[PDB]
């Protein structure tokens, strides 16, 4: 009721910079909604508060609702292009993806200017959400952060010391969370900054205690993430990733440690190899044929085609890739 909200607001409003609070708001309303509203009415209307929402549509929807409901409070929406030198005063409703456009120093300069940062629906664990949480935690000392919470076919990952070290693919499962695939995709958000997103996630989760952890999986993912950012990404690969409609461009970034040429593996209908190939834009790819590429990162179907055809994946071809393999073997052992 109002008794528990006033206590929650007073606990939030008295937080010092460098502090974190987790909130479970089971009933009502809420969250998104009345919590940052009550916080801003307490700290002052011209102070800045950020509310991070996973879906862009959900952000626009809260923004519309709140601005009509509370005309006395200023509201801002950030779901498109970066508003350069943004200093807008009320509650800012932004998607996590909006902040994924910023470099680490730009991100910090933007973030520190908010009195409070509300991480809404953290349980969704989207790649933009996982990247932002890990990235902002790197300067958490400078922030007041509050995390709030209320069959199907999904991508899963397999990790091994035998190359391809990463294998991703759809899996049949019950309904709503396994965030490993989203964590792997989130890694793309630290390439340009030379940030290990896995390390940032592990460090954030140790302080914030938001997610359950599979220690072996995190350790393996962190070893692979170090390989990912070990060298500057080639400009040719950077351009392809920025422009392709490929569902996992990070595959291009991981594979560049062995090959610059993407390969088109024949599609699998039922449990058999077809004369069909999935062609994505900007790749300038060759078909598999009988020459299997030295992939670090493969898809379940790419691996399946290799098996069905009687082919073998190559072994690590350089020091870096041989070392990732022995590090992964040590960790499993």
Swiss-Prot record:
<feature type="glycosylation site" description="N-linked (GlcNAc...) asparagine; by host">
    <location>
        <position position="196"/>
    </location>
</feature>
<comment type="function">
    <text>Multifunctional protein that contains an N-terminal protease and a C-terminal helicase, playing essential roles in viral polyprotein processing and viral genome replication. The chymotrypsin-like serine protease activity utilizes NS4A as an essential cofactor and catalyzes the cleavage of the polyprotein leading to the release of NS4A, NS4B, NS5A, and NS5B. Plays a role in the inhibition of host NF-kappa-B activation by interacting with and inhibiting host TRAF6. Interacts with NS5B to enhance RNA-dependent RNA polymerase activity.</text>
</comment>
<comment type="subunit">
    <text>Interacts with host TRAF6; this interaction inhibits host NF-kappa-B pathway. Interacts with NS5B; this interaction enhances RNA-dependent RNA polymerase activity. Interacts with protein NS4A.</text>
</comment>
<feature type="domain" description="Helicase ATP-binding">
    <location>
        <begin position="12"/>
        <end position="150"/>
    </location>
</feature>
<feature type="glycosylation site" description="N-linked (GlcNAc...) asparagine; by host">
    <location>
        <position position="279"/>
    </location>
</feature>
<protein>
    <recommendedName>
        <fullName>Serine protease NS3</fullName>
    </recommendedName>
</protein>
<feature type="binding site">
    <location>
        <begin position="25"/>
        <end position="32"/>
    </location>
    <ligand>
        <name>ATP</name>
    </ligand>
</feature>
<feature type="short sequence motif" description="DEAH box">
    <location>
        <begin position="120"/>
        <end position="123"/>
    </location>
</feature>
